[PDB]
Each structure stands twice: as structure tokens, then as C-alpha cells.
Write a structure and sequence with these properties.
His_Pase_clade-2; alpha/beta; Histidine_acid_phosphatase; 2 domains; inositol hexakisphosphate 4-phosphatase activity; 12 strands; 39% helix; sugar-phosphatase activity; binds nickel (II) ion; EC 3.1.3.2
Length: 412
Amino acid sequence: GPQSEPELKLESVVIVSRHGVRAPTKATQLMQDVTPDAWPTWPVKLGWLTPRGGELIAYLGHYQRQRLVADGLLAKKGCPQSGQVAIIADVDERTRKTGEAFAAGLAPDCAITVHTQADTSSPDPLFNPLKTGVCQLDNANVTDAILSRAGGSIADFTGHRQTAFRELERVLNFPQSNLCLKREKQDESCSLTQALPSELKVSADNVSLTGAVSLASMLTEIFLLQQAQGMPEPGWGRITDSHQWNTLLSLHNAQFYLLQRTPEVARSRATPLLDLIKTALTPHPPQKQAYGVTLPTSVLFIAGHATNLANLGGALELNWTLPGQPDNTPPGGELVFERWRRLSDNSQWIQVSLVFQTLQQMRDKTPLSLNTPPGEVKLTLAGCEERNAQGMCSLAGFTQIVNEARIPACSL
Ligand code: NI
């Protein structure tokens, strides 16, 4: 029967995805000391992707295949022709296995290659050029920029978020913790922000926060991973409604806003990824390039980290909050770049979106499909001056934004 008159044709898609659910990367004395309760153990070694984690990623891959078939970019049956789908992953187990899980869902039994750099025992500069010393952060500028975004000091920052820290204290049963019961001394109410003062540390290669701010960001992420993993009682059963989830994860999102979205950090850290993305999106005779991948092509899946998603958002002025997903940068969350050809005049356009499983979709292990899709937020490029009716940025305008956002000294 007669369907919607096609207005745009999908021509290429680049998905920058966070790795899936992975077991907490560290078990520290400080984590022991801020709660009287025992942290539940995990079925895999520290930092590794869990089997359920891979299954959640494979659901997104399945969904992406269905919708890309609907958009006419992939064939309904069969394996994608050689090179039509490419997968690049960071060197970590959790990212390589994420790449494999997405391929297993997108194109089961097609043995699509998950490419990495040659040495998997060393950091890949594409996913953070600061880490291998390709470039350095400007200490004065990063310090000023982050402190300003914090409200002027980290003390201002925590002071505005007392509600969330006390919610974290409740979930930990902090008052009955060793940090609290051993304090000096007994007549002062115990406070997480005050027992662990937080400072901003800026070095050439890294920015971090100490004390309660970074501890809170880690611990609230752990609760969310317990939830997504199907653990019986995340937060020892003390997280019972969605207001509580949002409140807790606000501490995690707030640290990412400071450390990973601040452009003075994000532009540098995202520069190699920016170049790769623009390479994949630009019409051009196909050519073997980074990782031995031929670009451009139909679908490129990049398996990285929440920081990468946050850095790109910061560099490109893309803002988002995810309905039903308390974590702004959730396991498996995808920043989705698409090149669309407008049929009326054959012009080229770039759309950006953020695709993600809701927390309940992870909790219930909900298989995804066209009738049960993941969540999805349409994004705008804040700096784009040439938009079409759908909010996309012209190819030329996207290229200028990337050329201004990137830092040449951080390129590969
Ligand atoms: Ni303030």
C-alpha cells in the first residue's frame, strides 16, 4: 500500500557506544569504610564485561539491524557485504567484547571483525590522546574553566548538592559506617562531604576530583550497574523509587559535567574521535584507513567509554538528558551520527541522536525491536548555522564545527 513519501535517504551511520555492563573496576578500603554493609560480589573479574552486559549490547545490535533495514541501508536477510559494516574497539576486554556483542546482534554468525590497534596491551590514543602524551592540557585554562562550571569552587559545588549526598548517605547507612563510628568525635553529625573534602587536581594528562565527589560518582554508578545486572537488591534494598535513582545518579552526572564535558578538556580528549567520525561521514571514494578499515562505508560501530561520549558532547555542544535512564552516559549508550541525503536537491545532512536502554529495559533484560525500541533523544549541534526542517546540520556546517572544535595538537 502507499507509504510515507521518502524525504531523506539514509546513507551512512557512525555509532559511538559505551561498553556494556562491566564489573566494578576496584574494591577499595574507602568503599569498605563508608558502609557497614557488604558490597555484593560480581560474576567476573574486576572491570570485565558481564555475560548479561553482552546480551544487553546484542539487543541494541539486533534493534539497529531492524531499523537500518527499515531505512534501506542494510539487507533484510544475509550477511552484510564485506566492509559494509565495520567495528572498531578500544583495547580493553570490555570494549572488544562489546564490539563482538553488537556484531552478534546486528549480524549473527557473520563473523564481522572487531578491529583494534595492533598492541592490545597498550593504551590506544584514539580513545584518549592525553594518556599516551600526544598532547597536554593547559593547566591554568582547565583549572579556571572547571572551577567556574562548578559554581566557583568545589565547596560551592557540593553545597548545592547536599540533598543528593544525604540521599547517598541514607543508601550507604553511612552513619553506622566505620568512617563515621571512628570519627573525632562523637558529638558532631557525620557528613560525607566533610569527612572526605574534595579538591580539583589538574595535570598535563588528566583531571580528577578527590574525596566525596569522586567517591559518590563511583558508588552511584555501582548501584546503577547492580540494577542493570539484575542483582536482587541494589543498594542493600534501600533504593526503592525512581526519584531516588535520579537523585543518586545526579552526583555521577555532575562529575562528568565538570571533568569530561568542560570544553577545555573535552575538545583535546575528543580530537582523534572527531577526525575518525568526520572521516567516516564524508562522501569519498572508499579507502583503507585507520585500523585497516575501509572508509567511508555503511555502518561504523566504535566501542569506547562514557568519557568518550561526554567528551564528544562537550566538544560538539550536544546536550542531553535521558528519560528513564538516570545515567547521562549509560552502559551501551550510543551517540549516533547519520549522514542523510535530501531527495529534493540531493544535499547532504548530519543528524545526531543518543540511543540508550532505559534502566527498566536493562533491569528487565527487555529484548529490543521496532515495536519495543530503546530510548532515543534527538540532539542539536548548538553551533550549527545551517539546519534543515528536521534539525540536521548541513554537511558543510558540520565540517566547520568539527574543524573549529578539534585541537590540531591532539590529532593522530
Ligand atoms: Ni553557586
